[PDB]
Design a protein around this ligand. Structure first.
Ligand SMILES: *[C@](O)(c1noc(-c2ccccc2)n1)[C@H](CC)NC(=O)[C@H](CC(C)C)NC(=O)N1CCOCC1
Ligand SMILES: *[C@](O)(c1noc(-c2ccccc2)n1)[C@H](CC)NC(=O)[C@H](CC(C)C)NC(=O)N1CCOCC1
Ligand SMILES: *[C@@H]1O[C@H](CO)[C@@H](O)[C@H](O)[C@H]1NC(C)=O
Ligand SMILES: *[C@@H]1O[C@H](CO)[C@@H](O)[C@H](O)[C@H]1NC(C)=O
Ligand SMILES: *[C@@H]1O[C@H](CO)[C@@H](O)[C@H](O)[C@H]1NC(C)=O
Ligand SMILES: *[C@@H]1O[C@H](CO)[C@@H](O)[C@H](O)[C@H]1NC(C)=O
Lengths: 412, 412
């Protein structure tokens, strides 16, 4: 019924043993690829709880970021030694499959160590690994399956979903993308607005942008050839990303001051997972190189193929079989909320609902946790005051949203 | 040399006695008005430290909000009983005069209890009270004087400054306004942008606003007569201010859930100052009614006269004798940063400097604390991630800014 050689017996750093079973080993991707997974079964009724795949983005970043720092059952502490139980873990109500992907990311590897890849190969390799998961965990084949991820997984998840939807053996029910890259064009255009209206660009630069980049009511901050325009957008990019502002959360400090995503400090997770006894407990082959949160070389060699997920989401929507959610922390600048809201609105789906706040109960009382824009089979949500890593910044709100999604309830 | 009957001997709730002298009593305003002051001398060298007037806004709100909750030498704790020393107090480097104004606000009163007033009378009464302060504290007449305040004090301070500048006996050196109301028009126009680009309004409403309120490149969200326009702006106002979003800090909870400014809880300060022994220590006449942070009736009866401080600041700038600062926490929606930046840019002053980040040292290191836009004798600054009450939300950054201002140093 399970790869019991993969079972995690006693995880270092945990003061209490888990009530749920958990597994760490390798799923077969395409060719010679072996993708490191860490599967944490539901804390409540895993036999009948959904199976939820989690993919972090990059490209080249590890989904074990999602486990140990966002919504895993325990989170690594600043000592890089202690794990503490997370009261907002997504595995409270789901069997969560964190997958280090593509090959070369974290503990994932391949026999030839050739890690140059692309969107289509990545989707196909993720698909084969999910096939392997269900060969390894056959008692999970009939559980409702949701595909979820973050950041560049805005591309990984919908492309993977299109493959999965053609496999009647997988009980695909839904996909959720957090601060996802869905449209380079909508991302880039929305980002320049976001920057000005969050007080990062002044009047002089804005007016320069307006002159060289825009024609009457429409701005092009994406593929404009205009000369001063390219120049100005270079300045925007510098301000937003290369000046000491944290691009992942405008209102958070830049770690380090004004494999090392900018303004971020991955030392806790890194120190934890490179502990030799941690790797033993996670059944990592000793010969594998050190764990990094993001593989520089995977990212360097990656050929990005899709500029928009418009056609993927229209395909997923046409079946009317799946619930889809795009959610953005609204102080993120890497994949800002507005570009994904524009993106969802532009799918032009039926049953449009008026935009509303959605609430969470804090003690403190009901608070607005964000806004929800709903259509048939698809909702866009903001998470108010969260950056790129929504479940780290607003764990209760993230858990509440996640539960409403799995249960196909209204978000409000 | 001082009204020693006003001296505060032993303030309830303080575990240690202050190193500085402090005073609480009444300054004579115009007619029968008596304005309650609380003056806290500098913790370092009060004889040669600047005199800084602080005014909160409303109209009808108490400057003792500024003392006990923003930048006073001690801050009231959630028990409404304990005061704790504030390591970022503005009185570390200044003699700070907190003035409850106009008559009827907090412990301020008048013999006829007639509290209907207006901008011009308020400025003239504040002016006479400052004259009285210097009659009561004559050893302070030659200290550099700065006039500072917050919110509606965006109107109080510049109007007062114009009066003070005509009095050669006062050594006026500068004025600073935090999240100030400077221009109803620039406030309202900037606010509708701010709302859309912070994800509070969706596409449908934005497009409706664009259609009914705007003509080609210019929007009028201020005095538009257009019909759907008024309707839509009513919806914006509802979303921003009457729906459970905290207008003073978009990213903060609304106290109470989705004399009581909305989403705010003044119980700590209120419980402290209504303690009968607190009032005795502050030399408050026992017959005075209870302390409220904002006087409902003062605000109700207030006749607001100025729609813009353009002409006041141009007068203050013409002398070239004063340094001026407008600073806004950038997640405030009551007086959003963008309207005040537009306002300062529109004064069209010389020696314009390119817009820059300004830094603060946290331990954590240097962090961007906001952006600074500088001209001759006037700077606009943002405080990144602060709401309406900048010194509560970012006390170190507020103190750092305040020190650079008093010392006429660059903000960066
Ligand atoms: C997203 O895919 C992502 N994946 O991992 C992260 C991450 C952020 C903070 C901490 C840990 C992980 N984010 C985004 C989508 C834009 N990808 C990234 O932000 C890239 C992360 C690299 C692989 C280290 N970075 C970039 O795309 N850029 C482009 C602009 O120049 C700076 C970095
Ligand atoms: C500003 O003058 C101000 N003065 O005191 C405050 C304050 C905010 C939070 C907590 C404690 C004090 N702010 C602003 C300038 C717009 N004034 C206010 O926000 C008014 C406060 C009243 C007097 C209680 N409120 C309003 O102007 N409105 C107008 C729109 O409808 C709602 C309240
Ligand atoms: C990074 O994180 C580690 C572990 O939490 C911490 O000890 C270290 O000081 C952090 N900061 C920097 C700037 O390295
Ligand atoms: C993506 O990768 C596959 C597998 O290597 C390769 O055959 C294919 O040509 C690639 N696609 C592109 C456009 O490079
Ligand atoms: C208001 O503040 C007081 C004092 O800090 C606190 O005890 C009370 O619970 C607060 N909240 C509400 C909703 O009254
Ligand atoms: C403001 O108040 C003064 C004092 O009462 C009064 O004489 C004056 O007419 C007022 N101004 C206006 C425009 O109401």
């Amino acid at each position: 019924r399970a790869p019991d050689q993969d079972e995690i017996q006693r995880l270092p750093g945990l003061a209490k043993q888990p009530s749920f079973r958990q597994y760490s080993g390798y799923l077969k991707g395409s060719g010679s690829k072996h993708l490191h997974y860490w599967f944490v079964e539901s804390q409540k009724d895993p036999e009948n709880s959904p199976v939820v795949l989690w993919l972090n983005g990059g490209p080249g970043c590890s989904s074990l970021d999602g486990l140990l720092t966002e919504h895993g059952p325990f989170l690594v502490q600043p000592d890089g030694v202690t794990l503490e139980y997370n009261p907002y873990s997504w595995n409270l109500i789901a069997n969560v499959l964190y997958l280090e992907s593509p090959a070369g990311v974290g503990f994932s590897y391949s026999d030839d160590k050739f890690y140059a890849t692309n969107d289509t190969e990545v989707a196909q390799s993720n698909f084969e690994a999910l096939q392997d998961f269900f060969r390894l965990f056959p008692e999970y084949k009939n559980n409702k399956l949701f595909l979820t991820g973050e950041s560049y997984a805005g591309i990984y998840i919908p492309t993977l979903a299109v493959l999965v939807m053609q496999d009647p053996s997988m009980n695909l029910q839904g996909l959720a993308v957090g601060n996802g890259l869905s449209s380079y064009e909508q991302n880039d255009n929305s980002l320049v607005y976001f920057a000005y209206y969050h007080g990062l660009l002044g009047n002089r630069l804005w007016s320069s942008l307006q002159t060289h980049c825009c024609s009457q009511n429409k701005c092009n901050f994406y593929d404009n050839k205009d000369l001063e325009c390219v120049t100005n957008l270079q300045e925007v990019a510098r301000i937003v990303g290369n000046s000491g502002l944290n691009i992942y959360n405008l209102y958070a400090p830049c770690a380090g001051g004004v494999m090392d995503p900018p303004c971020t400090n991955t030392t806790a997770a890194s120190t934890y997972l490179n502990n030799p006894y941690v790797r033993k407990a996670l059944n990592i082959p000793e010969q594998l190189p050190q764990w990094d949160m993001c593989n520089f070389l995977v990212n360097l060699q990656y050929r990005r193929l899709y500029r928009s997920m418009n056609s993927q989401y229209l395909k997923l929507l046409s079946s009317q079989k799946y619930q889809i959610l795009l959610y953005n922390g609204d102080v993120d600048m890497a994949c800002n909320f507005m570009g994904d809201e524009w993106f969802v609105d532009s799918l032009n789906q039926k049953m449009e609902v008026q935009r509303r706040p959605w609430l969470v109960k804090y003690g403190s009382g009901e608070q607005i946790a964000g806004f929800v824009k709903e259509f048939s089979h698809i909702a866009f949500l903001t998470i108010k005051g969260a950056g790129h890593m929504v479940p780290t910044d607003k764990p209760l709100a993230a858990f509440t949203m996640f539960s409403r999604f799995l249960n196909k309830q209204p978000y409000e």
